[PDB]
Design an enzyme around this catalytic site. Sequence first.
Site, PDB file in Angstrom:
ATOM      1  CD  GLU B  28       5.692  13.359  -5.849  1.00 53.61           C
ATOM      2  OE1 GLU B  28       6.885  13.566  -6.179  1.00 53.61           O
ATOM      3  OE2 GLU B  28       4.754  13.284  -6.675  1.00 53.61           O
ATOM      4  CB  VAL B  29       1.958   8.583  -0.083  1.00 49.89           C
ATOM      5  CG1 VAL B  29       1.318   7.219   0.153  1.00 49.89           C
ATOM      6  CG2 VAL B  29       3.225   8.750   0.773  1.00 49.89           C
ATOM      7  CG  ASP B 133       7.598  12.537  12.109  1.00 49.39           C
ATOM      8  OD1 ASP B 133       7.305  13.562  12.746  1.00 49.39           O
ATOM      9  OD2 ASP B 133       7.416  12.414  10.884  1.00 49.39           O
TER      10      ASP B 133
END
Lengths: 288, 288
Positions: B28-29, B133
């Site tokens: 989670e940022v 990615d």
Amino acid sequence: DPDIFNRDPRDHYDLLQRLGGGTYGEVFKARDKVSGDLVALKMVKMEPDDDVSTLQKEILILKTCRHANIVAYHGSYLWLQKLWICMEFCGAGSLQDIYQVTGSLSELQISYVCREVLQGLAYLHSQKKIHRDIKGANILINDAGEVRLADFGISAQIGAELARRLEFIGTPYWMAPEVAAVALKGGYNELCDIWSLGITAIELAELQPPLFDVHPLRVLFLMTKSGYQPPRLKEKGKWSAAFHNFIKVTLTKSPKKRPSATKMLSHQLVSQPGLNRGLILDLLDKLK
Amino acid sequence: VVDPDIFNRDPRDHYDLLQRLGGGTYGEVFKARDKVSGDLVALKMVKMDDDVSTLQKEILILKTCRHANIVAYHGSYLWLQKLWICMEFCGAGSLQDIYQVTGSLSELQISYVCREVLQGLAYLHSQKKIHRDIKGANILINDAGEVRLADFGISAQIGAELARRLEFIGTPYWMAPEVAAVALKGGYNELCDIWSLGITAIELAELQPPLFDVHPLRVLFLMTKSGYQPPRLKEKGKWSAAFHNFIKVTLTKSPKKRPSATKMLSHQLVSQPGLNRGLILDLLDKLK
Ligand SMILES: C[C@H]1C[C@@H](N)CN(c2ncnc3[nH]c(Cl)c(-c4cccc(C#N)c4)c23)C1
Ligand SMILES: C[C@H]1C[C@@H](N)CN(c2ncnc3[nH]c(Cl)c(-c4cccc(C#N)c4)c23)C1
């Protein structure tokens, strides 16, 4: 498996001796209580939170195989947190069990073993199955000198690993087609078994696979280089030109050039006329 | 140990958390502010018996990258079973944050971004790393108009998998060279990132990657078919021949014919004369 017997295997069999283990599990020599027939029972310990995928895939491979040169499957028993896979027992054990007492096999004995392995591989490859663990320890010999491929443990683990890849591949819209192909079908094909058969032929001739005395990680690194040269038989004069050529075409470095099992069955070494179980009965006589 | 340079302190002693920004591949940022510097940072919190392998490799990548086109790394914290990775706060967010507000980027803005991404990829590939990615969500724009690659979570997961395979591969003497190659290097290479950048350039042009409305499993299976055709830009007239050709060459189906990041830096689209930070400063002005 939906056809698993929910009963103690000891109700139908008597456990005679511990044979050791394969890729996973413990194998026992056992006796059928109604016929006296010997069987091998492979026991794998179960735990409440165990991923069942590998065992589920191994049973499916054994159940769907119906060929002389692949170990017969007699069902599986699940009882008191232990799974028991019932398979064909081969009285002489594996070829590694044998050549450790007898020494090197003869060229005709190797040729018969290779033709039998090829019949099993051509069958497996036709059913879109791969063994991936061809070696002397997984090629069994029964009392009649017949040849059976055993231990689909590596094959089952790879199949489970591949199913896991598809389940966690994530969003694919930015993924290159070769990344998608390795997730779905893996980075290699069934022609890897043709190479392992070539290494196994050398192992039956010299009692060890090529480079056996060098560190395991060093072999993996040397094999991945572009200058890697496929192995060869050490004693040139001891073996015929047809055997050397069988090693050269099975041990073709590139999978796109490597012949298939069906193509390998028409090769001179294994399509020769005097190949039968009698050659292995001679090896077993040397054992006794 | 996850990281030898780790701080064994509550990151909240040094930072005020300001807002939840969402998640990366994992974690989670948060947007946060340094209590003494007043500087803004992004803090990525990950819950950490756990195998520290992928988080250890993510920190190592961030730590060992010294590049103008890779998100800056500040350090890491471990406190009460939570690992916090402190990285650069990029004021304009991701390119996905930008194009959903401003609409499709201009061809020159896309060209500048592609050039900057190629510079970061050429650097990463020279250090033996693969991003795996690349997409608009992982390309950030800071207040200085700089283009920075972010989220090495997939790359770390893949490095951890390649280390977990090598430790459990077993005896390699009977393995075909191609099997030994997928165990140590995987079934693909860094050219997968060049394909992902081609898909990203279409995403910046059309606000979605190609086939975004198709079921993810269908897209994956379609890439493994012999007649597979790579995607293209939908509106021909809107884009110059340089942009159509950039898509054509980055999206080369065969990895053997797809150009490297360094080769792509000499492509007509990204070697064009007016590609400067002024294009991104002008994009940022439009956001305000
Ligand atoms: C663990 C092996 C050690 C070897 N020395 C003797 N093995 C056998 N001997 C006689 N009949 C047998 N039938 C079957 Cl199947 C096996 C077998 C062989 C190899 C792997 C696995 C498994 N999974 C089972 C076997 C057992
Ligand atoms: C979760 C992202 C949602 C996006 N809307 C805004 N992101 C950012 N914005 C401003 N500075 C940032 N620095 C870093 Cl690093 C990120 C970032 C971006 C993408 C993935 C990860 C991770 N793992 C971190 C970031 C956060």
